[PDB]
Amino acid sequence: EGFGPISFYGDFTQCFIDGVILNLSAIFMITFGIRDLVNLCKKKHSGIKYRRNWIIVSRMALVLLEIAFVSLASLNISKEEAENFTIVSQYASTMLSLFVALALHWIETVLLFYWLFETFGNFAKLINILIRHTYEGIWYSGQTGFILTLFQVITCASILLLEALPKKPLMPHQHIHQTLTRRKPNPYDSANIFSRITFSWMSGLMKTGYEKYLVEADLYKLPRNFSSEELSQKLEKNWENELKQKSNPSLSWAICRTFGSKMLLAAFFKAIHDVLAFTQPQLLRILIKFVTDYNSERQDDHSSPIVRGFLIAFAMFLVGFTQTSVLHQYFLNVFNTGMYIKSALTALIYQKSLVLSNEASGLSSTGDIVNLMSVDVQKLQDLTQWLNLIWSGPFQIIICLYSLYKLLGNSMWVGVIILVIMMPLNSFLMRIQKKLQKSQMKYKDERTRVISEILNNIKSLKLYAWEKPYREKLEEVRNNKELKNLTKLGCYMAVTSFQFNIVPFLVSCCTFAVFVYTEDRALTTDLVFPALTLFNLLSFPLMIIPMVLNSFIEASVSIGRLFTFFTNEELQPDSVQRLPKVKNIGDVAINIGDDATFLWQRKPEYKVALKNINFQAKKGNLTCIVGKVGSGKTALLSCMLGDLFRVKGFATVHGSVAYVSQVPWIMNGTVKENILFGHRYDAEFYEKTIKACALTIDLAILMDGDKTLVGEKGISLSGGQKARLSLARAVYARADTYLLDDPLAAVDEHVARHLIEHVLGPNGLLHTKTKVLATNKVSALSIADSIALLDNGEITQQGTYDEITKDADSPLWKLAISLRRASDATLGSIDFGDDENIAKREHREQGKVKWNIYLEYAKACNPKSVCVFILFIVISMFLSVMGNVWLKHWSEVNSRYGSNPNAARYLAIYFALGIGSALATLIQTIVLWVFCTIHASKYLHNLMTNSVLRAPMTFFETTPIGRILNRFSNDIYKVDALLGRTFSQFFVNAVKVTFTITVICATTWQFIFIIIPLSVFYIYYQQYYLRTSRELRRLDSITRSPIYSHFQETLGGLATVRGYSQQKRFSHINQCRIDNNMSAFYPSINANRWLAYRLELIGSIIILGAATLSVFRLKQGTLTAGMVGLSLSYALQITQTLNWIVRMTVEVETNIVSVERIKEYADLKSEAPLIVESQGDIKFNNYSTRYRPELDLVLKHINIHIKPNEKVGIVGRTGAGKSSLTLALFRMIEASEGNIVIDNIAINEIGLYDLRHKLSIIPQDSQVFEGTVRENIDPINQYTDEAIWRALELSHLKEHVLSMSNDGLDAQLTEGGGNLSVGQRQLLCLARAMLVPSKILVLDQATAAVDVETDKVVQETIRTAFKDRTILTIAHRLNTIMDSDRIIVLDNGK
């Protein structure tokens, strides 16, 4: 009898079956008895005490196990024919089944895997018996018991399916658990290993995303060991372990000690994946050896076992499947580790920032502290993906080189040498790519600046009618940007794809060249195709290894930054105790120790300290602190807050604390939220407080209700509104102790006077509590119960007003109701941001993924270029495939003619094929980028600019400026390169898979039957993942911003937050937001794993199909080894390419919607400004012309006549058609009920551009464009520089141009007009208007925005300058009104 790892026939030997089944039974018994049975039976007393209904599944499984045991016992009778170790196998299996009975009974993991290994072992034994039957008698070759063994196999399979698939339903009120129906619990907690490996649990979420777009109810709660709290505590213990042995590497070592446990498991799976992947080419070589030896044996027998091939194909499937499962488990583990790192650090940094000292917060810049959570933690999350990669890279290349030496012949490092030569060239080309991309980002920023300057001041450009020269300037900037885009992208896409194609081909070519030249012993197909597969596998990790080290260095820098931030000094908790509450009036509430000395001077012992002062306040009083700013007033109040490092003095504060700062801080939410501030709502007390402090005007003035959003991003608020809001918050959150830091400074004197008595008065709203006020309000000093005078960092006088009046008054004077504290909110959940806009935009239409938008984009691009593009692509792939098949033919010729090569001839042909394919890829990626790609971008930009420039005032006033501004920058930036790259990669991979299937179907007529339903499964999975992953990634993108916004807000307001003592509320808010963001993140990662698993399984299935069909054709008749070798070598590359195709499909689907939005914004319309078919001695006339939007009425039946040489004033009440008459005169509104006539010509007949050129206007502002003053004032070179200088001197702005512009008339104007006052900008606009030769002169809102001298200058200038030109003005001052020849009173409507 034979013995070995595998017999002659390619199956496991019977002794090997005994060994593996004994090992399976041993590990099952050991693991179950040690781990599972004892834990389950001791979780509660002698078995788990949870209810479980007895169901047909359980008793059926038990009966099937008993039948299996009986069948095993029956088989044991015949097994005693020969005395070997198989009796020990029988006994071990019997013991294992007997234990498994109790194992199944007790639970109602190890059970599932034991049953799986049992079924696989019995299947292997059955295969061995059948193979021996093929070698021997028909049925009972080994023994007659195989008939019962078949029943044992199918019984074990049925037991495994019935244990795995159905669940464990529970009868007694299973529905009672799901009270909180807001979000379902995740299925991951209830998921066996068999379901968790394949990620079948995500299939329900995938289907839900397919049928319906995602909402917050669809997502599941995160499982345990993901919440912020446990992660933060687990990191805090490791940080204390840092504090034992403190040093700079302590942070990294604490991180690795905490969460690095699963990284070892990840490394183990990565090693298994790598060794299996490099084992796969060895199995391919063994199959090649088998088929060629089979053909030689058949030839020799004609001169004078295919089941092995089938088993080899089954082995290929097995290694593919275990590679798939192992790799995806590795990715799951490392991404879970990255999630844990993000969850721990983003909360611990928040805690550290909350406890942080005000000194270090003041010195340190807040933006960097925001960047700590923004970029540095994300860098570590990125690092956690690739750490096992840098661990495995040397191992991977070493195993690859070892296999290379063992296969193709030793010492041939020529492929290694050429790729090592090519690698640093790529390392330099990526560097210059990054430099060029940064330059393009700078160009994008300048483009955004220019288009923002165009967009905000568009009304000035349209009224002035100077639009097309600045359009030409923008087109020049776009031309320079397009030149930069060409100079980057043409050379980069030339070199990149060319090098990536050249590398493996030149490696293969030079290796085979050296082999056929120097070594002899011709290839004969045994070495060539495994060598090609190994060269393909070698290129992947060594490309990744240099780049990832740069990210490692960046992560080291981030670790250092986090370490110094965590090892900041912080503040001492023990400076002033929050002693229990004091109840009476006059009862000591605040107490500062005798000769107490406080400071801001802990680190170097600065002289930022006060010395030897005592101060007291009893309960129920108004203490007042008086002093100038910089007199230590805020220092004393900070001493009261306990936010200072004190040197000497014992201090105690009684009861709760409420504080208001001189700079108010406001929550980023509703005003109702701000006043509430986490306390329980109380209607009557809220109304009494908002009556006392605020009035109704404070709500009404905002043009919104109580639920208005605060101006952190909503509507801005005045300083008086902020002070009133802070005082409102204080009184509503009325504490035992009250502290006020000059809240009355912003508010007006008389209104504030109302506030002194109304709120804190002796009969004030909250007079029953202690209250310190730091102020300079003389009335409040007079009413104040106690006085303190702080000057030069010392309370110079501390005495009651009676004592102050007795002494010389020069030093300062000449200069029961308890309310039940304030209740709290119960720290509930938190809703996501509003999703209704994008939700209704998505729900308004469905079924968008078809070819309509793609064909529209193709019509926008050049349609003829796409034909030559696809032609070059397909002939390139065809050339590569023909090179490979001719190489197969050459190897077969070498196989026939033993060691008689014409390698020079074929190597010349092969090098020609390679250079042709490389030339095709080079020319197509060069020329078509410079053809279809950049030209379409120019077309889209031209259409967008042409549409947006001519758009109406309705468009500009209705749409947000920032919304369209960001879309113009972001979408045009995105469409420039990313869409082209995604399209190129998608088409290349599409032709790759198409030609792979073409060659596979060429080698076998009967392959279409297997390829078609797998293609159905592929498109099904791709459609589901494409529909779901976009919405999951959208939720992930939306959830990021609240974290950074809330963190920056908390950094802004830490002082008040800490004083208010709401630390737990803010920590819980940040923690819940982090849990929300992670709930967005996790299903996207798991969906990626699920899709990649199913595609890789499809890859393994097609590998198995190609192998078994090739072996079947070999059985049927002649089939050369080269054909099957080429087929398998091409088939092995399908796996990565399918996943890349699906990812590029997702990328292009995400990218196309922005181009659709750009095209839709290119659809708007306005009438022509052309000169289609005019000043001085002209009668003006209006007749019955309304000009407004259809949605509203202002003007009505207006008609007038004006003779030449008149000065006219328009006057009316608020809303009495002030600017509407001016806009109607300008014909800004296209609607024309009647006729408006200038120079006996209707305005509508001529046009817009020339008419607005023929009239000069000052439209109630002075928004001006940036750049040179000459370019702004006189952009078209009308007449000399002395003319504009004379006009400027007339405008009396000679002081500005004397101050600036020393070198000449080249002064640079800052963008936005902030460099100079509004009056000087009005003078500039006046200078322009006077410079303009046209007669018609208009001024709007003349009187409101003048400082007397400006009104004088403009009035005298328009009086004296335009002698006979007709001038109209809208103003409010009576003298300039009455100076006009005819005063028209603008009516309410008519």
PDB file of N, CA, C and O in Angstrom, residues 983-1000:
ATOM      1  N   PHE A 983     -12.400  57.611 -16.859  1.00  0.00           N
ATOM      2  CA  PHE A 983     -12.858  57.062 -18.134  1.00  0.00           C
ATOM      3  C   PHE A 983     -11.773  56.223 -18.796  1.00  0.00           C
ATOM      4  O   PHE A 983     -12.051  55.133 -19.314  1.00  0.00           O
ATOM      5  N   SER A 984     -10.525  56.706 -18.770  1.00  0.00           N
ATOM      6  CA  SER A 984      -9.425  55.962 -19.380  1.00  0.00           C
ATOM      7  C   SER A 984      -9.204  54.629 -18.674  1.00  0.00           C
ATOM      8  O   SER A 984      -9.085  53.583 -19.327  1.00  0.00           O
ATOM      9  N   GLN A 985      -9.171  54.646 -17.337  1.00  0.00           N
ATOM     10  CA  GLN A 985      -8.954  53.408 -16.592  1.00  0.00           C
ATOM     11  C   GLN A 985     -10.109  52.432 -16.789  1.00  0.00           C
ATOM     12  O   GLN A 985      -9.886  51.223 -16.953  1.00  0.00           O
ATOM     13  N   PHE A 986     -11.347  52.943 -16.799  1.00  0.00           N
ATOM     14  CA  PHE A 986     -12.512  52.088 -16.992  1.00  0.00           C
ATOM     15  C   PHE A 986     -12.499  51.429 -18.365  1.00  0.00           C
ATOM     16  O   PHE A 986     -12.745  50.222 -18.478  1.00  0.00           O
ATOM     17  N   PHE A 987     -12.190  52.192 -19.419  1.00  0.00           N
ATOM     18  CA  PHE A 987     -12.179  51.604 -20.756  1.00  0.00           C
ATOM     19  C   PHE A 987     -11.035  50.609 -20.918  1.00  0.00           C
ATOM     20  O   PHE A 987     -11.208  49.562 -21.562  1.00  0.00           O
ATOM     21  N   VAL A 988      -9.869  50.904 -20.327  1.00  0.00           N
ATOM     22  CA  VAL A 988      -8.731  49.988 -20.421  1.00  0.00           C
ATOM     23  C   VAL A 988      -9.057  48.665 -19.731  1.00  0.00           C
ATOM     24  O   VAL A 988      -8.819  47.581 -20.281  1.00  0.00           O
ATOM     25  N   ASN A 989      -9.642  48.732 -18.532  1.00  0.00           N
ATOM     26  CA  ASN A 989      -9.972  47.495 -17.833  1.00  0.00           C
ATOM     27  C   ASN A 989     -11.122  46.757 -18.513  1.00  0.00           C
ATOM     28  O   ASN A 989     -11.163  45.519 -18.484  1.00  0.00           O
ATOM     29  N   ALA A 990     -12.048  47.492 -19.141  1.00  0.00           N
ATOM     30  CA  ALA A 990     -13.139  46.852 -19.869  1.00  0.00           C
ATOM     31  C   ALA A 990     -12.609  46.042 -21.045  1.00  0.00           C
ATOM     32  O   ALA A 990     -13.003  44.885 -21.242  1.00  0.00           O
ATOM     33  N   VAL A 991     -11.702  46.628 -21.833  1.00  0.00           N
ATOM     34  CA  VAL A 991     -11.146  45.869 -22.952  1.00  0.00           C
ATOM     35  C   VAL A 991     -10.264  44.733 -22.446  1.00  0.00           C
ATOM     36  O   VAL A 991     -10.160  43.691 -23.105  1.00  0.00           O
ATOM     37  N   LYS A 992      -9.602  44.920 -21.294  1.00  0.00           N
ATOM     38  CA  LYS A 992      -8.811  43.845 -20.696  1.00  0.00           C
ATOM     39  C   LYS A 992      -9.679  42.625 -20.402  1.00  0.00           C
ATOM     40  O   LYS A 992      -9.360  41.505 -20.829  1.00  0.00           O
ATOM     41  N   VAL A 993     -10.793  42.827 -19.692  1.00  0.00           N
ATOM     42  CA  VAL A 993     -11.652  41.692 -19.356  1.00  0.00           C
ATOM     43  C   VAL A 993     -12.304  41.123 -20.614  1.00  0.00           C
ATOM     44  O   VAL A 993     -12.485  39.904 -20.732  1.00  0.00           O
ATOM     45  N   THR A 994     -12.643  41.985 -21.582  1.00  0.00           N
ATOM     46  CA  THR A 994     -13.272  41.506 -22.810  1.00  0.00           C
ATOM     47  C   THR A 994     -12.327  40.612 -23.605  1.00  0.00           C
ATOM     48  O   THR A 994     -12.719  39.535 -24.068  1.00  0.00           O
ATOM     49  N   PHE A 995     -11.067  41.027 -23.755  1.00  0.00           N
ATOM     50  CA  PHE A 995     -10.113  40.201 -24.486  1.00  0.00           C
ATOM     51  C   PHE A 995      -9.748  38.943 -23.709  1.00  0.00           C
ATOM     52  O   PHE A 995      -9.468  37.903 -24.324  1.00  0.00           O
ATOM     53  N   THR A 996      -9.750  39.008 -22.372  1.00  0.00           N
ATOM     54  CA  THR A 996      -9.520  37.804 -21.579  1.00  0.00           C
ATOM     55  C   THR A 996     -10.619  36.775 -21.826  1.00  0.00           C
ATOM     56  O   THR A 996     -10.340  35.594 -22.071  1.00  0.00           O
ATOM     57  N   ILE A 997     -11.878  37.218 -21.801  1.00  0.00           N
ATOM     58  CA  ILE A 997     -12.978  36.298 -22.073  1.00  0.00           C
ATOM     59  C   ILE A 997     -12.932  35.830 -23.523  1.00  0.00           C
ATOM     60  O   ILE A 997     -13.311  34.691 -23.821  1.00  0.00           O
ATOM     61  N   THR A 998     -12.474  36.686 -24.442  1.00  0.00           N
ATOM     62  CA  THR A 998     -12.363  36.289 -25.843  1.00  0.00           C
ATOM     63  C   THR A 998     -11.364  35.150 -26.021  1.00  0.00           C
ATOM     64  O   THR A 998     -11.653  34.165 -26.705  1.00  0.00           O
ATOM     65  N   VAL A 999     -10.182  35.262 -25.409  1.00  0.00           N
ATOM     66  CA  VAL A 999      -9.191  34.194 -25.565  1.00  0.00           C
ATOM     67  C   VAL A 999      -9.651  32.929 -24.841  1.00  0.00           C
ATOM     68  O   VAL A 999      -9.426  31.805 -25.325  1.00  0.00           O
ATOM     69  N   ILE A1000     -10.317  33.082 -23.687  1.00  0.00           N
ATOM     70  CA  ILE A1000     -10.799  31.910 -22.957  1.00  0.00           C
ATOM     71  C   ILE A1000     -11.868  31.177 -23.762  1.00  0.00           C
ATOM     72  O   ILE A1000     -11.883  29.941 -23.811  1.00  0.00           O
TER      73      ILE A1000
END
